[PDB]
Structures are given as structure tokens and as C-alpha cells.
Amino acid sequence: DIYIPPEGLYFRLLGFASRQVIFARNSPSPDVGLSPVNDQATDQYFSLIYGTGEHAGLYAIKSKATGKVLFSRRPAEPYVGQIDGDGRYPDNWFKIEPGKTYLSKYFRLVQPSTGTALVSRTHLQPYFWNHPQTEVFDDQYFTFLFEDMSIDKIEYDLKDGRILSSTPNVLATQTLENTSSQTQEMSFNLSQTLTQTSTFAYTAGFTIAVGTAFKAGVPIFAETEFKVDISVDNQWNWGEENTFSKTYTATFSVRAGPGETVKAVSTVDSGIINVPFTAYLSSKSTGFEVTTEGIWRGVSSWDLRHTLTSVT
Amino acid sequence: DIYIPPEGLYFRLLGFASRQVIFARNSPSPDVGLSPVNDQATDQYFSLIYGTGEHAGLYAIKSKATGKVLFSRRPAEPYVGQIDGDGRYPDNWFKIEPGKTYLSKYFRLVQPSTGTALVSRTHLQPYFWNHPQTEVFDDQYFTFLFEDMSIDKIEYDLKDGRILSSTPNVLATQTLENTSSQTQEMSFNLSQTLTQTSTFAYTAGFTIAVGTAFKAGVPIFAETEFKVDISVDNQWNWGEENTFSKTYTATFSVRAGPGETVKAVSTVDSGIINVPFTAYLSSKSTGFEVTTEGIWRGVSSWDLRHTLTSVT
Amino acid sequence: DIYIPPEGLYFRLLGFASRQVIFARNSPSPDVGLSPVNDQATDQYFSLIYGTGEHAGLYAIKSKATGKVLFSRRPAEPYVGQIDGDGRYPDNWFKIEPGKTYLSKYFRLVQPSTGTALVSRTHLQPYFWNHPQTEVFDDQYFTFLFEDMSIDKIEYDLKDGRILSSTPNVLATQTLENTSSQTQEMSFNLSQTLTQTSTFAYTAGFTIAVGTAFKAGVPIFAETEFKVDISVDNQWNWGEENTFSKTYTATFSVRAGPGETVKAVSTVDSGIINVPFTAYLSSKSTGFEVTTEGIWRGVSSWDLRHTLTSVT
Amino acid sequence: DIYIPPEGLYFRLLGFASRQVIFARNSPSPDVGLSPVNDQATDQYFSLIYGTGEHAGLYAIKSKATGKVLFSRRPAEPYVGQIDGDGRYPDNWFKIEPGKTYLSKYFRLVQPSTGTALVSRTHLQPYFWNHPQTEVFDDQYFTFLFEDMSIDKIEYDLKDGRILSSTPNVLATQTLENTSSQTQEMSFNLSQTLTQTSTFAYTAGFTIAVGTAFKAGVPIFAETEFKVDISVDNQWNWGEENTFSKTYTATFSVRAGPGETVKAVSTVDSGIINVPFTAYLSSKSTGFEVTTEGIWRGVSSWDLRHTLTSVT
Amino acid sequence: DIYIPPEGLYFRLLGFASRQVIFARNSPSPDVGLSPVNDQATDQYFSLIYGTGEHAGLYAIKSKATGKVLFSRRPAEPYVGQIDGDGRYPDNWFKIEPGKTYLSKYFRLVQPSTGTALVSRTHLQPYFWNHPQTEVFDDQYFTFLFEDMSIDKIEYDLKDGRILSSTPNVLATQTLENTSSQTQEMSFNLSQTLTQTSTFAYTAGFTIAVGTAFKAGVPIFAETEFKVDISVDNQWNWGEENTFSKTYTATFSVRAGPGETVKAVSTVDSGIINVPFTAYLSSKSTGFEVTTEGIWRGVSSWDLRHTLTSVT
Amino acid sequence: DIYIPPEGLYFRLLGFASRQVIFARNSPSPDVGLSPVNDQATDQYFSLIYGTGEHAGLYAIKSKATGKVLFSRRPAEPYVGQIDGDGRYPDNWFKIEPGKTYLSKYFRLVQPSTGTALVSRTHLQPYFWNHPQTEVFDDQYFTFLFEDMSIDKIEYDLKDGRILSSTPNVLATQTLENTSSQTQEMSFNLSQTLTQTSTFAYTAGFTIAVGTAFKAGVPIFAETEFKVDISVDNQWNWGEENTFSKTYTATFSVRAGPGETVKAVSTVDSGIINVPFTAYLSSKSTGFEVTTEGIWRGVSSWDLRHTLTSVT
């Protein structure tokens, strides 16, 4: 079940085959066609108008540059183009038809009343065109390349945290020092660094572009509960594994007995952990809000422990 | 070691560079060339004929539409095309030469006796052509895009199941109720939902297209054994991680002692688990059978436990 | 360090050798001597008067029947007997000298100013007499046989309880019943009996006679704490091991899932346990109070547990 | 932070949009342009010259075939091409500007003093050209396709090994044999095979091409330490999960008691494990050295155990 | 609740005070009195006749030597003696009145209709006599010294066995031998001896004399069950702690791998254990049967274990 | 198997029945008889002369006061007495015949060639006499009351130590203190006292009198080994349970992290423990040496542990 944008949200239509994007302008001379992506060209941005009535479940595609709406039709030339009136004509309404396999993030834009499918290709002219819908070719598939969106907030569902694995890792055994009897002080220092892991995986909602850079706190098991470690300021990449460092730091002293040599074993539970979350985004142009649901996953550490003994 | 189809199995030849597929028809006028993929165009489907004798280890490429066989040759024009006789001529026999790195699912189709390599490109004409085999370019590489195949059956090798991790997850501690002494009944309810995981990973045999939708039971650890949970009816995607829900349900009652307050702790072992399997497929056009070996992998839960105590 | 009674507390003086008790009456004719024990003969009861001044650390022995006080002297006949005035004369003051080995609950009654030791024997006349203190014979040793004392109260020091051993004992595994699927009710019953143990061991204070019958609550480990089980009404014997029965009783039901056979494992921690205590006693004749400190020890059971599972 | 090659290291410049590579030759007639990749064409190889002085942080791009250096300029025709003098002119210096999202392994090659960006496209002529830098299109992005590099050595950092999970897997319980009493010999055999896993993941340094085939020892937990298993001779693929087999082999005998039936339980700890490492590479043409840092990850087994008991 | 013998069972009546035994003969001249114990003198043996009717709950004391029955009476001289007719006269019936404290294994023999108590003393004549029952002296107390009884059988209640403690004791770690690689044989020997413990404690039934020598099997925990170790042939002493030796013996071999040094750890669970039992006895003179219930207690060992590993 | 003294070791012969001791002097007038025990009267001390030749396995009883040797004979008056010549006559040789049950620490002194048994009684004259050996009475039994012996040394067999039980006892949980963040010092104090236990039980060798006071170190489990705690200076009593106190003392500090509240859990393993030993004694009069083997037993504590954590 593919994510279709609501009405206030802008996007590009990237063709599978052409690897190029639809434009709609007023001038210059060819008013619609294909172009290499330019993020700053308003030309290439479109939003949808949700059909109602008999058009419920269909969509018109409104140019942001121009305000006009796309059309696909067979007899009258040209077969595709732009036009006023927010879907006045039956030519402006489109069924979104998701593909399968390697086309499962792609979809057709079929206009049913004319039995016509939008076409995006570089091998043949015109590059942006249509085709009889019954004959399905790969160059009829499109994907959404959404407008740049800022990740305002990550809110974890900590109650539903989960430990998927757990093994003790001894950070520093050694740290054992002596002068048999009375004395008074033996001070101990702990500085050990573990490479932890972090992945923000899509689950539902808005499709954040893979690779998107952002910052956030990352989950942590305390002793009986999950919490957010706000200290960790690494740049994450949406949907990819990142690594970060966690340094464990402690100082503690001992000696006060008859005649003993102190040992200090500093130990941690490490293992895989995961936590659901919801991200909150907004359009950088507009302020328009969406959310994304996700599961966060990471190799982590918890329950720092220092154990003190004696020998003779 | 790449998977080469046996004789009854159909496929497209997608070019690395052209991102387009070979066709062979009788009419219209140019009888072989390149086209965007159309699953329903018989045109684009081919099977192999396994060379024997001096041609052992080589292959002819028979058009499904036409019945003719591909050829590559140097002096006589045109250099490539179609012809009768199931590899009558030495021009019809091809060595399949797998690439490396980003071309490791791709291969060349070299015809040795002419020292010639098949070419698939969009930058230069003719698009489908050949080239002297000693000069290796990226546009000589092809991959198999097999015909649509139905996944008839998944059969797990349960004896070889494996737990890769295990930690206790307490589903519901709380569930503790009281009225000090005699009474009679304290009933308890359990409804807790864990997000489980599922991945069907290729290992050997037929190369199922990544993303392929299907349904099956998914493995489970019982107490001393692996078994299949037939309840779970989610749509899987071959070679990708999917998530599903497992709800744990129980009702149990207690009180019958001197003077105690009952507690009920409902607990599960969760962790990663994996199980080999063999899938059985068949051509949707023909009925032709293959198998695929795979390892299934998943975050799961097992050994549901309820523990009852007392307090004063 | 032997227990010497305070001034309000009555006792008999049993001789090691004679196995007979001192009497002091007014009539009949021989006013002091030895007799077989008769609990009701006031004759045989004595209390001490604690020397002060130069007599500090010494004791006079006052007859309860008569009110007079014992004397031991050498030149004047008779060497032992009775007399008025609560230790008026130096002849009435005695050093209590504990024995060793088999005489460590026994002691001499030496009157230092005359250098004379009290004698209790059946082999030679007079049976109750004295002897030069420097020549030590076994028939100069005496022990206290205290008046009958009622055990009014046992107060345990529960904070200082201790588990000396712990092993799980499965009371009833079996208790597993089935009718594969839906149904609704599977009820389970638990009745299992463990032979527990109980010993009230002297530690300090008043020397309760070994074998003394009484009743009390007996300690128990709850989950995080020691408590007194008031239910257990067995007759104990001071300083001896007793056995008692503890029956564990529970009823609980289950079934509510897809298709499972329920198992129920009822289990306990058993092991040795011990708890300090103070007993409070009083004279049955008089009301005079003392205490005894002790450690209580017992094989016991704790943490009753019922664990419910499933099979197919 | 993208990996930029030092001066002795050769590469191709693959365009995002064109999916074609820059060439620079002396003859034939068009001396620079785009071509499909040919690994053996010196034509397509370039190294960088690190700007210094006012050009510090910028780079010239020297042709390996020709020795000349690339230029981008606006007024004078042609806008791009080749020229003598290792960056004599300001036209030869380039800022490398990494992309984001799907372009994060790609970068622009902007020549600042002319305000001009290099262009690689197939939709419009000339295919290799430039464009005003302020108007950013997708066809200005390039990635490095480095020269073939041999993996000479893998050196693990064994002290920093880590167990991320651990569960016991019983390989063979059964293996229990009998003839009640005296006899003498009961011999036992163990042959059990576990499918292990191996992944060499990039972390820092030189960007080894994903899929690169090589051989190496793979880490192992001994009892108190990580070590390299040199036995395992599988072909690995850089940055991808591979599987391999580990067979556990043992023979041991028993019987010598009063009257017992022997049992033998052969058991292993399995679980996920990971270990940092540094790889050492060198150019196949030149011998030029680089390194790559990585974390190795794998499902593994450790601590083989045989436990012998008795029955009657 | 003291053990009173049934009618076919013989005994001596030992006085607390006299430490001497009642006799009844025909000749010589004084026909009843006291004597030092002689096991072979029929003289000193008596059985009881259980009163019925109005004499229910009372007992006559029949001489084994003579067949006559004891009497106690006040007015007529002599006050005690012997007479024909198995309790014809009211003078022959006795209430058995258990003492307390140090007299709790002792009892009075009071003849109620005359209000008279039997007397056993050495300090005054006649030594065997009676006294007005209302005046209670210590020399009226008697205990049973039963006839010699053979212990024919011990039958344990194994289902009700119990582990009161359990800790692992490593018998022999060391036992580790090497010659790095191929070889073939490494044989291992185990001979380790633990001092075990054994106590047969009275619980109910016939009062076996403390110290009684006998032989029997002694309990043992197997793996899931208690069993009798028939091997152990030590002489036990009823009601006392005995020690015995248990030697653990095993031989096992190993080597068959790539390149490893074998270690062998031989280990046992030791701890306290106890088991109810019933003993079966019979008179050595007569064959007359009784039983005794008891709890057996012992420090023991169980679950012998050998664990084999590897090093490099 | 009773302990019979070697030739240099002195003793008294205490009669079971008489509870009196044999004397042999030169004057006054009756030269042998019975007397109440006087430790300082040389009169009452005897050693044995081990028969050889035909007298092997028999013993003469030499008076320490007099140097003469005991005799028992029938026809000639008096039947018992004293005489010169260290067993010149057959009248001076005695078989030691251990009793059973309550007489198992007692024995007869039978002189076989006259068929005569030594007699010790208070009920009949002469008190010290003999009797025809075939008629066995209780007043023919004797026990050894050895001369006062000093306990010079206890040497434990530490390698053969054993833990019979083990449970963790938390001494002080609480000890948790806070001031959220930076600060620097949180110091912790531990003072907790456990009542331990100690019993020196006879096993073999010289029969140390029960109750004998002495001092020694007492065993202790360290971490991997038994050792002697020389600190513990309580007075022990041979063959009886004693109690002593063990105080555990420690001081340790902590804080040095981001923002945590420290907790400190001080814990010990407690449980029963036992260790074989050999004691070395010597005569206080003479210096004559013996040994005693024994098992020492005690409730003890070991492995002191302090565990430090964190909270927010």
C-alpha cells in the first residue's frame, strides 16, 4: 500500500525509464516536457487534487509554477499538456496504479475515460506523451520525489521497547592494585569505548528520502525502562545503519580491611535493542506537516556495573 | 556461480546500459532490436538451447514469438539477427561470461567462433548489434529477467532450525489482584502484542525476483523443536524484511489458600531465529517447475509462561 | 560462664555423685540432709543471697521452707547445717566454682574462710557434709535444678534471619491435562506435604530445662523477609529437634488460546534456616521473671510457585 | 565526508545522468567526450593534482592517457577540454561538492573562477560540457569508479572483539549407548555442520567496490579471546553477506565404573559476533597503496563442549 | 506419646534412681528385688498384659521366669511381690505415667485402687517397694530396656526423598594433557574420594536402642529419583552419625580434531539429603515382630559429570 | 573399634555401675578399692603393659602410685589386689572386651586363665572384686578416663575442604546515596555481623574428653581454596557446637559520571563447610604425645562482594 501525498504537499514525477522529471511552465515555447532534476525549478513541482463524486479515488495533477492541471487524451492533438480549471474536464483525472517487483515504489498514471497512460521516455519522441493503457510498457511508470522536508522531531514509544539480545561484555577486568595491609586509598579509573549502532527504519506514513541527514537522541535501556540519550550528537541518515561511540567513565576507591588486595571488574550488558517511534516533518517552502512511523534499531550497552573483591 | 535457466524456461535479456530488452518478431519491418519491457509481448521472451558435442558449455537463444535463433557474426551484414534451424550454424552459439562487482548479476553473450560480443545500447546505432569481443565495454552486459513464476509451496527444514539470540521479555508483570483471605476467584487476562519480523533470503537455485509477493506459514520455536505457524497470513516480499504482529492470549484463575494476594507474571523468550527452506515454483504460462533454496530469518517469540505467587 | 540465679529465683542443689538433692527443714529430727527429688517438697528449694562488701562475689544459700541459711565449718560439730540471720556469720558465704569437661554444668560450693567444700555422696556418712577444700573430689560438685518455669512468650529477631541452604523441590510436576482446542476450563489442585523441622537452641540467659514442653509460632521466609507462621500448633521440646508437617494448597484454572495442552509445575524452595529469639519466662509459684536468648533452626520451605505452559 | 583519492591513484568519472565516463585522448578527432566504461581504455583514467596556495582545497584532473589537464570555462569555445601545464591556468581548478540523498556518493565538479559546473548527459549535445554553476541540475553529478585494486591483507583488531549475542545450541544430544556393566569401550563420534555468516563492512578509508572478490581468515571466539580461523577458504564479497560451513568433529570414549549407561551431549555457543579490521590494498597497474577500515560481522559458534554422564 | 510394648514383647524395668532392674524368681529366698542388669537372666524379663473391661488402659506385669504377676498394695505385708492368676486381683493393675524433662523416657507404675506407686532405689530398704502415690519422688520412675531385637530389613520411602542442599564440588579439574595436533589418544583417569555421612533417626514406632549395630543400603540421588546404594557395607549405629567413603571412578579418552589441547573437568553435586524409612525387627528369643519409622539423613554426592574442551 | 592407650599414657578406670574409680596404694590399710574421682590422687592412675608372646593381645594394669600390677584370681583370697613383677604371674593379664549400645564406650576386664571378670559396684561388698566371667553383669564394665592432656596444635587438611551448602546473603543493600550530577565524592561504610558456627568432631585416634577447652584458628573459604582465619580467638569446646561472630568491614567511594545516583550492594555467600584435621596432644605430667583425627564443621561466610550501579 503506497503512500500518496495529501493536497498541500509538493513533489516531482520521476520516470522509471527516462530517469527525468515532468515540467509544466507558461514560457518558453514547449510548455510541458521532461527535464533533469533541478530542486529550485518550480516548473517541476506538482501537487494532487483529490477527486470527489464520480472522480472519487482519482487525482488531478496541478502544476505549482502555473496552477494548471495535466491532461491525457487520445484523438485531439496534442495528446498531453496543461489546462485551466482544477479538473473541469474528464481528461484531467488519473488512476494511480502501483507496480510490482522492481516497480513497487513506482506507479502508472492512467486516465480511464480515454483509456490512456502517461509516458516518460528518452528513446522516442515526444518524450512526455501517452499510450493506450491496455499495452503496458516500463516507460509508463513514475515515482514520487517529494519536496525537501525538515525533520522537526523524533518521539519514541519507550514503553514498547525490546531487548532482542543480551550478553555481558567485560570492559576492564585487570584494574587490580595492591599494598597488602593497612594503607587507606586505592583509586580506580574506567575509560572504555564501545562502537554502538543506529538505524531509523521506515514502517508507515510519509516516505522520508533514504539518506536524509538529521540529529536526534537515541534510545537506551536504564535498568527497568527505556530512555533517550540526549548526549549523542551524531548526524544520522534515514534508513541506513550509522555507527557512534559510547564511552563509559567512572572513578571509585576502596581499601579498609584486615589484609587484602583489591580487584575491580567493570562490566556491561551489550546487545541488540529496538524501539518504535514517530517522526514529525514539515515542508521547507510551506510549513505543511506530515508524520512517519518507524522502528529504531541498534547494538547498545546498558547496566554499568563495578564489582569489588579481595585476595591474600 | 550464476543461475542459468534450463531449456523449458523463458526470460527477457535486459541490457545493463540500454536498460532495454531484446525483441525478435517476424513483422513489422525491423525484425530484431531493443524495446522497453512489456510483460505481455511474446516478442521479448527467449529460452536457451544447451549446446552439445563441440558446442557443450555454450547456448543458442531461441525466440518464443518466432521459433528462430539469434546469431552474431562479423563480415556479413547484418551482424546480428534471427534464423531458422535450432543452432544449425556456428553463428548461433554463445558463451555466457559473468561480470564482476556491479556487473555480477550480468553477463556477456560472446559468440567465440566469430570473436564477437552482443551489444545493447541507446547512445549509438544500431542499438542491438555486436562488437569485437576483445574490446570489452559495459554495453555488452545482459541480465536475465525471468518470466512470471508462481510460488506454489514453501517447505522448511525444521530439524536444522537455530536460535541465534534469546532474552526474556516480560509481557505483563502487573496483573496482580487481591481481597486478602477466603473469597474464591481471581481471574486474569493476557493480551499483549509483539512486532515480529520475517525475511526469505536466497541461498541457491532459481533466482526469484526481489519483491515478489506471496503467502506462507512462518517458523516458530515450540519448546524442543521448530514448527510452522499457519495462522500468520501476511503478504511477504521475497528477499526483503517484513513485519507482522503476534498477539499472546491467555485466561487463568487462582485463589485457594489461608490468606494471600495473588501475582501473575506473563513472560516470553524473544530473539532472532533462522531456518533453511526450499521453495517450489512454476511458470504461469507453461507449468514448468523449478526450486529455490533459502534461509528464513526472523525476530520471534517462544515459550509462553505464567508464574503465580502470593503475599501478606 | 555459668548462669547463676538472681535473688528471687528458687532451685534445688543436685549432687553429681549422690544424684540427690539438699533438704533443710525444721522437723523432723535430722534437719538437713539428702533426698531423692520431690518437686512439691518446699524442703528442697533454696535461693541465693548475693554477698556485698567483703562478701561481694560470694553467696549465701537460704532455705525456702525454713528461711535459714546454710553453713560450712570445720572445728565445731556439726560441720554443716542451718542457721538464722541472712549470712550474719562468715560460715554462710560460698564461692561457686564451675567444673570442666563432664562437670562443666556443675560447680563446687566452697566456703573460703574455713577452707571447706560442701559434699554430696551416697557411699559414706554423713551424706551431706564438707571436706577440706584443697582435696578436690567429684562428690563436691552440684548443679542447679531450677523451679518449674512457664514459657510465656517467644519473640523472634526477624531482621537477622538467615538462609543457610536453598534448593528447589518440585512438589507436583505431573498435573498436566488436555482436550486440544477451544473448551474453556482446566482446573488444577495442589496438596503436597513436606516434613519440616524445628529446634530452639540455648544461646544465653536462663537455662531452660532440656525437654521443656511449650507452644509457639515458628519462623518462615516470605519472599524478601522473615515472618512467624502462627498456624503451626505443635508441642515443642526446648533444645531438641522436633518435626512438623506443612501442607501446600492451591487451586488454579487456565485454558484460553488457539490449540494447546496445559502443564502446571508447582514448586518450592526448601532448605535450612535460622533466626535469633528471646524467650520470656516466669516462676509458677511466684511470678518472678527471666529471659533466655536462643537461635531457632529448621528445615523449611518458601516461595510457592505455579508455572503454566502449552504444547501441540 | 566523502573519500577523495590522493595523487598517485587512478579513477573514472561516471556521471549520474549519462551513466557514462569521461575520456581524454590525443586522437581520434573529438579529443574529449563520454563513453561506456572500458576497463582497459587508458583514455578513461584520471588522477587528481591537489591544489596549493590560493588553489588549496581544489583539484586539477589529469588525463592518464594524455598527461593534460581538464578545463571548464564560459566565454571561449569550446567550454570544456584538455590542456598542457599541470593547472597553469585558473580554468583547471575544481571544487568537489558532494550531493545529498541519492547523490551522496556523487559530487559536482565546479570551477569557481568561471562559475561553471561540469555536465555529463545523454539527452543533449554536447554530452560532456558545462553549465552556469548557480543552476544545479542532476546531470552535473559524478562519482569515482576507482582503478582495479588488489586486497593484499586483512588485519583484525582482535582485542576489540565483541559478542553481541549468545545462546547454547545442542549439536547432538542422542549419542547415548549401553551394555549395562563391565565391558570396557564405548566410542562416540561427532560430525555436525552449522551454516555460519560473514560480512566485511566499510567504516572508513578507501572505498572498496561493493562485490569485490577476495579471500581471508575470519574471526572466531576461543574461550577468553578472539582469533583468526585460517582454515576457512571461501571467496568473500566486500560489503555483502556471505555464508560458509563450519563442521565440528570429535571422537571420545568412556566406560569404567560399577554398572552405568553412558550419555554424551555435544554442545556449542552460537551467536552474532563482530571485530574491527584494516584492509591493505594496492593498484594492479602501479603498486600504489591505500587502506580501508571496516567492521567484520558474523553468526558464529564457539566453546565446543562434551558432557558425559551415567544411568541405571 | 511414649512407646508401650504389645503383649508378646519382653523387657527389663530399669529404675531412674537405682539404675538397677526388677527381678522375679521362684528361688532363691527373696523372690523379688533389684539387680544389676544381666541380659541372660530370665529373672529380669517381663511382658505386659493389657487390661480390659474396667481395667482398660491399665497393665499387669508378668514375670517371664515365673509366669506370675506383680502386685502393689498398702496394708498387707509385704507391700510388693509376685502372684498367680494373670491379674485376678485389683492389686495387679498399673497405670503408666510418663515423666517430663529428664524423666520423659521414664514413667511411674502406679496401682490406682491402692493409691500406691512402685519404688526403685539403692539408698533405702527395701530397695524394691512402694509409696503413697500422691507423694512423687524421682525413685518411682522406670524405663523400658527392651529385649535384644534383630534388624531384619530397612525399606526406604524413595518417592518422598528430598535434597536440603546442593553445591557443585569439582573433584579433579587439572587432568589436562597435550601434544598439539594429530596424534590420536589422550586417556584420562578419575579416582577421588569423598567422606559421606549417614544417620538413622527415630521418628515413630518401636524404640530401637541407640547405638544398635546393623548393616543396610543407604540412599542416593540418581538424576531424577532416589535409589539405594547396595554397595556401601559399613556397620551403622542406630540414632548416631556415622561416616563412610564414596570413591568415584571413571576412564575416558578423546583427541580427534584440527589442533587442540584437551581439558577434562570431573564434577559432582554434593549436599545434604534425607529419606523416610521403615525398619522391621524381631525378637531373637521368640521371633515377635515390630516396626520402627525413621528419617535417614546424610551428606551425599550425585550427578557425576565429565566435561571436555579444547585450547590453542 | 575402641581406643586403647599405649604404654606411656595414664588413666583412671571408671566403673559403669559404681561411677567410682579404682585405687592402688601402699598405705593406708585396704590397699585397693574404689573412690570418687580426685584428679590429683596418683592412687587412681594406671597405665597398661602390652602382653607379648602367649600374652599378646592382653594387658597388665600397672599402678602409677605403687608400680605394682593388678590381679584377678578365684580360689585364693583375696580374689583381687596388687603385686610386684610386671605381669610375672598369669593372674595379671587381662582381655579388654568392649560393650554394645549404652556400654559401647565401656569394656570388661576379663582375666582368661582364671575365668574371672573385674567388678565395680556400690550395692555390695567388696566394692572392687571379681566374678565368674560367664555370668555377665553391668557392674563389670569400665571406661577410660584419661589423664589431663594439653592440645598443642591443630593442623587442617585444607586441600580436602568441602562446601556442603551455599546461598547468597545480602549484608547491606540500602547504602544508596545521591546529589544527582557533578559533585565528586560519595563514601560508603560496611559493618555487618554474622553469627558463625564451629564444631570439632572426633573421627579417629586419641579420645579427647568432650568439653575440653582450647583455642585455634578456624577454616575459611577464600575464593578458590580453604585457609585458616587466625583472627578468631574464641574458646572452643571439643565435640560441641560453639558460636562466634564475624564482622565484615569495608569503605569505598564512587561518583564520576554525567548524572547518576549511586547504589552499593554488599553481599556474601554463606553456608555449611567442613575440613578434616589432626590435633596434637601431650601429657601435662609427662610430655607423652598422641594425635586425634577429626572433621571440623561450621556455618561460615565467604567471597565478600561490593557492586556499584547508577540511576536517573
Ligand SMILES: OC[C@H]1O[C@@H](O[C@H]2[C@H](O)[C@@H](O)[C@@H](O)O[C@@H]2CO)[C@H](O)[C@@H](O)[C@H]1O
Ligand atoms: O509505452 C509507450 C510506448 O510507445 C511506443 O511508441 C508509439 C508512439 O508513441 C505513438 O506515437 C505510436 O503511434 O507509435 C508507437 C507504437 O505504438 C513505443 O513503441 C514503445 O517503446 C513505448 O515507449
Ligand SMILES: OC[C@H]1O[C@@H](O[C@H]2[C@H](O)[C@@H](O)[C@@H](O)O[C@@H]2CO)[C@H](O)[C@@H](O)[C@H]1O
Ligand atoms: O561495445 C560496443 C561499442 O560500440 C562502439 O561503436 C562502434 C560501432 O558499433 C561499429 O559500427 C564501429 O565500426 O564503430 C564503433 C567503434 O568501434 C562504441 O564506440 C562504444 O561506445 C561501444 O558502444
Ligand SMILES: OC[C@H]1O[C@@H](O[C@H]2[C@H](O)[C@@H](O)[C@@H](O)O[C@@H]2CO)[C@H](O)[C@@H](O)[C@H]1O
Ligand atoms: O570429698 C569428700 C571425701 O570424703 C572423704 O571422707 C572423709 C570423711 O568425710 C571425714 O569425716 C574424714 O575424717 O575421713 C574421710 C577421709 O578424709 C572420702 O574419703 C572421699 O571418698 C570423699 O567422699
Ligand SMILES: OC[C@H]1O[C@@H](O[C@H]2[C@H](O)[C@@H](O)[C@@H](O)O[C@@H]2CO)[C@H](O)[C@@H](O)[C@H]1O
Ligand atoms: O545542467 C546542464 C543543463 O543543460 C541545459 O542545456 C543548456 C545548453 O547546454 C547550453 O548550451 C545552453 O545555451 O542552453 C541550454 C539551457 O541553458 C539543459 O536545459 C538542462 O537539461 C541541463 O542538462
Ligand SMILES: OC[C@H]1O[C@@H](O[C@H]2[C@H](O)[C@@H](O)[C@@H](O)O[C@@H]2CO)[C@H](O)[C@@H](O)[C@H]1O
Ligand atoms: O518414693 C519413695 C520414698 O520412700 C521414702 O521412704 C519411706 C519408706 O519406704 C516407708 O517404709 C515409710 O514408712 O518411711 C519412709 C518415709 O515415708 C523416702 O523417705 C524417700 O526418700 C523416697 O525414697
Ligand SMILES: OC[C@H]1O[C@@H](O[C@H]2[C@H](O)[C@@H](O)[C@@H](O)O[C@@H]2CO)[C@H](O)[C@@H](O)[C@H]1O
Ligand atoms: O557381677 C558381679 C555380681 O556379683 C554378685 O555377687 C556375688 C558376690 O560377689 C560373691 O562373693 C558371691 O559368692 O555371691 C554373689 C552372687 O554370686 C551379685 O549377685 C550381682 O549383683 C553382681 O554384682
